[PDB]
Design a protein around this nucleic acid. Structure first.
Ligand SMILES: [Mg+2]
Lengths: 49, 272, 198, 49, 50, 107, 49, 49, 40
DNA sequence: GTATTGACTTAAAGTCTAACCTATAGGATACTTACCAGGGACACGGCG
RNA sequence: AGCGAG
DNA sequence: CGCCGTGTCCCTCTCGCTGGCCTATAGGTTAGACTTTAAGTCAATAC
């Protein structure tokens, strides 16, 4: 039984802490972190129109 | 000294003075310029002394060139306050001035949060004393030892070491990809839930206030400054309505008693 | 030594300077129109490597002509200071304050500028004041770009100080880590497991 | 580092007034050891799964 | 809101000096070594001649 | 989270643009002929000198002009010399220097 | 499915919901935009079956 | 790429960005001029028949 | 203000006059906050 | 319940005095120069 | 720094 | 005026997790209590 249990992997967020110099909330399950929406994902969205 | 005296004397005679003869005036200006020339020559000569002295303050606090320039300022001050009639070598006197200038600059322009000098000296003292008691006791001296060796209350040792906590950098890669900056939560941002909570609180408070009689609403409003953010006492509301202070006080008491009734409390609890 | 001998002897007939202010004077005494016209004539009539260097120079000498931009913006007399909350000083848990790594470069610039002011006010030999001016130039350079010239200005731990240009360049810069890609609310993550009944 | 501080102070040491205990400063050595065993990359957090 | 430091002496923007090609050098036709010498107080330069 | 703060705080208070305290724009003039408006509140004396955006202090542009005084130049090398030497020896040294230069020129 | 985590984003506005429902719906994207060959066709276990 | 060179040259040239591509619109956080963001689909007028 | 009144974005050299026109003051002292009261 | 007066006590200033920080100066044996990548593109100095 | 998916 | 060699600059994937010295002077600041004043409070009363 490997130590990659889903209980430590699940995470969700609707609102929480926001970074200091910029907004775009803190990342990480340790904080209440939002999931990074990078440039590749944004290109995929642009391709979808 | 001769150049300085010539400059001062001509400054004196620049106002209600005498038209000095061309030859004498020309010679005297040569003397003043020679005085400044001698000052520059001396400073250029002892720049090496300044560098050699500042060598021993390197590696801690600030950069090396800043130390050299502060030492140069100190040496200029020493040359300003140097006496030869006392018959002593220039280096002996200028060393103390350069040391003082460098140490003062270290005290001032070395820490992002400036601790004034006297505090700086007492903390540097604390550090040295704990270093020596570390040399002797071996284990880091506990606050008691420092307080004893420093003739201040131990709580003062605490605060002297609290003021001297150097900041850190929020641009440190915490790994050894992530800077410490983007791990720190802005604790003064609109949390977006208390904001809507406050909006609905104001809405429901306004409604429940509209329930009670109009005069009652007015008195409580202008008592806590809800209408425009300015709270006032009984006297002001009495003045504006042209009634003695006591009536406003009485109606306020009645208003509080009414609003405290369980009827108009379950519509306002869960907001406190 | 040669310069000083010249100045004391044929001091008039020529003005010489040293440092950024000298470049300031050069740009001041520089008519862009005549230089551009001469360069255009040289590129049109001449040929070879001389024409190549002439042509590259006309990609910067034309830019300051086509637009009504002065070539003076290169030389600074005032350095803008970024708003404080873009370089925050935060009381982290435990009281330990956290600087922004830009207050250090700004502090260095201001220290050296004030020291230059005091050195000029007192009256100092040209050696010390010129050294101070060179240090001020280096401080502004380090503020705008660390490590571009000489060893980078290092902070505690023997690491370079994050300058004012490092915020913009790279995969971890501002243009690419905080503008085209952002962290978003209303998002989650989890391990996926096949569902064939869906 | 301790050697360098010893040499530097030796010039300002009054002859016959000095003993190795008052001539040796151990702080650089302990500081180096402590900064190695913590924050050195080859001194890794023990992996006990 | 921004501030500004009033430099006691002028300085040159590094982006227009060190960034190859040296735009200051191309504008003034000064070799990059010469520009670096002048700007960092390593060699004098003549700005006017009657 | 490390949970830092910028010190200061927030204050949600419904922004009002309607009932606002009365203001009296006061003009100041720096040394380099640069005017600068400053919206001071009426219920306070308008100061006679303001550190304007220019970075240098400017006096009020109306009348008044109190024109105070301050300490003369913090110190000076001549003043420091006079705290360790007197006039007679300085004059004697000046005479020695003058005679030396005169001998240099004409002997 | 050997630990392949994935992220879930929630469209909020009417336009976002409409785009997610119409443009990006998984049952609307069968053919690969590259070559047009189907990408949702059965594979592995289903092909064997 | 090459942010410093690009900005140096753009500053020297007084280049004005018309904000017409997809990356610029994404950067400034306004609708990209593609797909549903173009001027013919965005301002569709909708009303009951 | 609004992303509709964002037609262009010009970049150019900022002369010293522009730099001191942006500024609301001049940082003259190399200080950040008080050591004890922790205030600007 | 809603119109008042006459005491009766109370916190908030408003101010004077005292100590504890703060900006600053000074210190006279003599000491005088610190310290492991590649891969591509472009530009500068030598040589023919 | 170790570590996971591709 | 070409060809060559050397120096310098920019680039090198996405997402995610865990945790590691001393002295002397002068001047400004605050804290602490005293005195005053606007402020909150109670008791009896008349309509
Ligand atoms: Mg996998």
């Amino acid at each position: 039984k490997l130590h990659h249990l889903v209980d430590d992997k699940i995470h969700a967020r609707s609102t929480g802490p926001y970074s200091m110099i910029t907004q775009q909330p803190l990342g990480g399950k340790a904080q209440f972190g939002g999931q990074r929406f990078g440039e590749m994902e944004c290109w995929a969205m642009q391709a979808y129109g | 000294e001769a150049g300085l005296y010539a400059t001062q004397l001509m400054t004196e005679l620049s106002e209600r003075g005498e038209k000095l003869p061309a030859a004498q005036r020309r010679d005297m200006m040569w003397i003043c310029r020679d005085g400044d020339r001698a000052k520059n020559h001396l400073l250029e000569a002892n720049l090496r002394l300044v560098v050699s002295l500042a060598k021993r303050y390197t590696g801690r606090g600030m950069a090396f060139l800043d130390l050299i320039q502060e030492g140069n300022l100190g040496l200029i001050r020493a040359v300003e306050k140097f006496d030869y009639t006392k018959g002593y070598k220039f280096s002996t006197y200028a060393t103390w001035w350069i040391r003082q200038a460098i140490t003062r600059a270290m005290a001032d322009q070395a820490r992002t949060i400036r601790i004034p000098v006297h505090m700086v000296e007492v903390i540097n003292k604390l550090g040295r004393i704990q270093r020596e008691l570390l040399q002797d006791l071996g284990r880091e001296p506990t606050p008691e030892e420092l307080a004893k060796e420093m003739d201040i209350t131990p709580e003062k040792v605490l605060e002297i070491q609290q003021y001297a906590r150097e900041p850190i950098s929020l641009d440190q890669t915490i790994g050894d990809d992530s800077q410490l900056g983007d791990f720190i939560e802005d604790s003064e941002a609109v949390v977006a839930v208390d904001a809507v909570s406050f909006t609905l609180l104001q809405d429901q408070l306004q409604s429940v206030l509209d329930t009670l009689s109009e005069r009652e609403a007015g008195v409580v409003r202008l008592r806590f400054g809800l209408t425009d953010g300015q709270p006032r006492t009984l006297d002001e509301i009495g003045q504006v309505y042209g009634v003695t202070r006591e009536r406003i006080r009485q109606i306020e008491s009645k208003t509080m008693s009414k609003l405290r009734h369980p009827s108009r409390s379950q519509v306002l609890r869960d907001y406190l | 030594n040669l310069y000083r001998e010249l100045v004391d002897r044929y001091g008039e007939y020529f003005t010489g300077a040293m440092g950024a202010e000298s470049i300031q004077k050069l740009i001041e005494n520089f008519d862009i129109d005549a230089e551009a016209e001469s360069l255009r004539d040289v590129i049109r009539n001449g040929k070879g490597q001389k024409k190549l260097r002439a042509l590259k120079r006309l990609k910067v000498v034309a830019a300051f002509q086509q637009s009504g931009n002065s070539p003076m913006g290169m030389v600074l007399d005032a350095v803008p200071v970024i708003p404080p909350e873009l370089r925050p000083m935060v009381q982290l848990d435990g009281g330990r304050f956290a600087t922004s790594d830009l207050n250090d470069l700004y502090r260095r610039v201001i220290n050296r500028n004030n020291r230059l002011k005091r050195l000029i006010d007192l009256g100092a030999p040209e050696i010390i004041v010129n050294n101070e001016k060179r240090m001020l130039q280096e401080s502004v350079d380090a503020l705008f770009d660390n490590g571009r010239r000489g060893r980078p200005v290092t902070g505690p731990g023997n690491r370079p100080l994050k300058s004012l240009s490092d915020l913009l360049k790279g995969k971890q810069g501002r243009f690419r880590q905080n503008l085209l890609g952002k962290r978003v609310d209303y998002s989650g993550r989890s391990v996926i497991v096949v569902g064939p009944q869906l | 580092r301790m050697e360098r501080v010893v040499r530097e102070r030796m010039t300002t040491q009054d002859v016959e007034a000095i003993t190795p205990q008052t001539l040796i400063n151990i702080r650089p050595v302990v500081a180096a050891i402590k900064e190695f065993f913590g924050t050195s990359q080859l001194s890794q957090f023990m992996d006990q799964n | 809101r921004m501030g500004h430091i009033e430099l006691a002496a002028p300085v040159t923007h590094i982006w227009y000096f060190k960034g190859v090609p040296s735009r200051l050098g191309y504008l003034l036709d000064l070799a990059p070594k010469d520009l670096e010498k002048i700007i960092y107080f390593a060699a004098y330069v003549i700005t006017s001649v009657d | 989270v490390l949970r830092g703060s910028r010190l200061g705080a927030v204050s949600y208070e419904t922004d009002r643009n309607h009932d606002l305290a009365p203001r009296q724009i006061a003009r100041y003039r720096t040394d380099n002929g640069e005017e600068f408006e400053v919206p001071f509140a009426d219920d306070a004396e308008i100061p006679g000198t303001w550190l304007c955006r220019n970075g240098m202090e400017g006096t009020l542009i109306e009348g008044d002009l109190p024109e105070p005084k301050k300490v003369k130049p913090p110190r000076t090398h001549w003043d420091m010399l006079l705290e360790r030497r007197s006039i007679e020896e300085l004059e004697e040294l000046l005479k020695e220097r003058l005679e030396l230069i005169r001998s240099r020129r004409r002997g | 499915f050997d630990g392949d985590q994935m992220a879930v984003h929630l469209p909020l506005s009417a336009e976002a919901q409409a785009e997610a429902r119409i443009l990006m719906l998984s049952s609307n994207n069968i053919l690969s935009p590259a070559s047009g060959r189907p990408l949702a066709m059965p594979r592995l276990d289903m092909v064997t079956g | 790429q090459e942010t410093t060179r690009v900005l140096t040259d753009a500053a020297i040239n007084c280049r004005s960005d018309k904000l017409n591509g997809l990356k610029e619109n994404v950067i400034i956080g306004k609708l990209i001029p593609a797909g549903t963001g173009i001027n013919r689909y965005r301002n569709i007028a909708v009303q009951p028949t | 203000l609004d992303v509709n009144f964002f037609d262009e974005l010009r970049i150019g050299l900022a002369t010293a006059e522009d730099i001191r026109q942006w500024s609301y003051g001049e940082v003259k002292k190399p200080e950040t906050i008080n050591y004890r009261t922790l205030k600007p």
